[PDB]
Design a protein around this ligand. Structure first.
Ligand SMILES: *[C@@H]1O[C@H](CO)[C@@H](O[C@@H]2O[C@H](CO)[C@@H](O)[C@H](O)[C@H]2NC(C)=O)[C@H](O)[C@H]1NC(C)=O
Ligand SMILES: *[C@@H]1O[C@H](CO)[C@@H](O)[C@H](O)[C@H]1NC(C)=O
Lengths: 182, 197
């Protein structure tokens, strides 16, 4: 492991086929700066104040993805069409800040060992699905070339309210729920 | 005026639940030590989970990491060798000095601190802070505890804040004062929280 004060990933690219699924991000010290929406051709900053002084031309993401489409084709053939292995992801749920009755908070679902980078993370309150107040990060790179990902649910902590983080992935026979209560 | 973030160029080679898939990845990594005094550039080309080709500026050229990349390294060294070398300055150094210095490295998020009880154990919750460097200390009637002290790993929230939990092994007596004491770059003086038996 290389010793450094800081690490920028100024170019993280992934592409897979079939399905034409791809992602381009920048990170600094392990946090996402932005991803380029490759279909809308625009830069989407993790926090909106990142882009108030700084610009990233989406074309750089387009450059990387086109090169990776090409590289995927060549290396697939050179490997004698060795397919990727579907991993089984694993999830941990924890609160953003200490849980206090009636005080708005955020429940965080951290999901690791994601490969290939295609997944569903959804939330359940009292076994009923919740779509409001949900944000999800990009696929963030791991040293072993798998990925991790976080989903965020805004909630008001109450008495015996019950949450599950539900993960579905090709490497899972059935969706895994990760439970959580105060 | 707006400043531009630059990127490391992905060089190109020459020329579903049960469906097979095939994955490729490119990673452009800039390692900084003491600002931009030491920079190290490492770019990686990966098929599925196998990194096969790497540029490492401590080496100075592309090298095959595995046999799959034996001929890739010879092509990339012919086509992109000195372009990639120059990226150490045109991309890594520029991005640090012109874009990280005014943003990522000026970010300061002060921790929040709360004590609660779980012999017994006090839990000091230190949350919502950035950057990662922090020191947490426990004291008992004005004297620092060092034995009986454990913490979780640093938790990365993904939203550019961290948290950590720091636990004290303790038996409550008398009217003692336990204090959780937090030092952090966002804080000119420590934040403290007192808990009384
Ligand atoms: C993520 O969720 C979507 C929606 O639930 C899945 O897509 C559906 O998959 C079912 C499974 O049999 C199909 O019958 C539907 O036709 C699909 N609907 C839509 C709208 O896509 C998707 O497969 C999930 N992904 C993973 C990896 O499990
Ligand atoms: C290529 O892969 C096929 C499919 O598994 C295998 O049967 C064969 O041995 C391989 N052939 C060569 C020439 O590598």
């Amino acid at each position: 492991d290389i010793e450094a004060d800081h690490v920028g990933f100024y170019g993280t690219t992934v592409y897979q086929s079939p399905g034409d699924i791809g992602q381009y991000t920048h990170e600094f010290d392990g946090d996402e700066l932005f991803y380029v929406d490759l279909d809308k051709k625009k830069t989407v900053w993790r926090l909106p104040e990142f882009g108030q002084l700084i610009l990233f031309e989406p074309q750089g993401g387009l450059q990387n993805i086109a090169a990776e489409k090409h590289n995927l084709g060549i290396l697939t053939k050179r490997s004698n069409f060795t397919p990727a292995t579907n991993e089984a992801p694993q999830a941990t749920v924890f609160p953003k800040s200490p849980v206090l009755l009636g005080q708005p908070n955020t429940l965080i679902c951290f999901v690791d060992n994601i490969f290939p980078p295609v997944i569903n993370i959804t939330w359940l309150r009292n076994s009923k699905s919740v779509t409001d107040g949900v944000y999800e990060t990009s696929f963030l790179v791991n040293r072993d070339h798998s990925f991790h990902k976080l989903s965020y649910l805004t909630f008001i902590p109450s008495d015996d309210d019950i949450y599950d983080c539900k993960v579905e992935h090709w490497g899972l026979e059935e969706p895994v729920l990760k439970h959580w209560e105060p | 005026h707006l400043v531009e973030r630059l990127y490391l160029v992905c060089g190109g080679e020459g020329a579903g639940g049960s469906e097979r898939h095939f994955v490729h990845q490119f990673k452009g990594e800039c390692y900084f030590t003491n600002g931009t005094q030491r920079i190290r550039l490492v770019t990686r080309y990966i098929y599925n989970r196998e990194e096969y080709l790497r540029f490492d500026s401590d080496v100075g050229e592309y090298r095959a990491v595995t046999e799959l990349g034996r001929h890739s390294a010879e092509y990339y060294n012919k086509q992109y060798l000195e372009r990639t070398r120059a990226e150490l300055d045109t991309a890594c150094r520029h991005n640090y000095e012109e874009t990280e210095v005014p943003t990522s490295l000026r970010r300061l998020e002060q921790p929040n601190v709360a004590i609660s009880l779980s012999h017994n154990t006090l839990v000091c919750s230190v949350t919502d802070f950035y950057p990662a460097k922090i020191k947490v200390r426990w004291f008992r009637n004005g004297q620092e505890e060092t034995v009986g002290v454990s913490s979780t790993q640093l938790i990365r929230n993904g939203d550019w804040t961290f948290q950590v939990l720091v636990m004290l092994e303790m038996t409550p007596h008398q009217g003692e004062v336990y204090t959780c004491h937090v030092e952090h770059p966002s804080l000119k003086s420590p934040i403290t929280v007192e808990w009384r038996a």
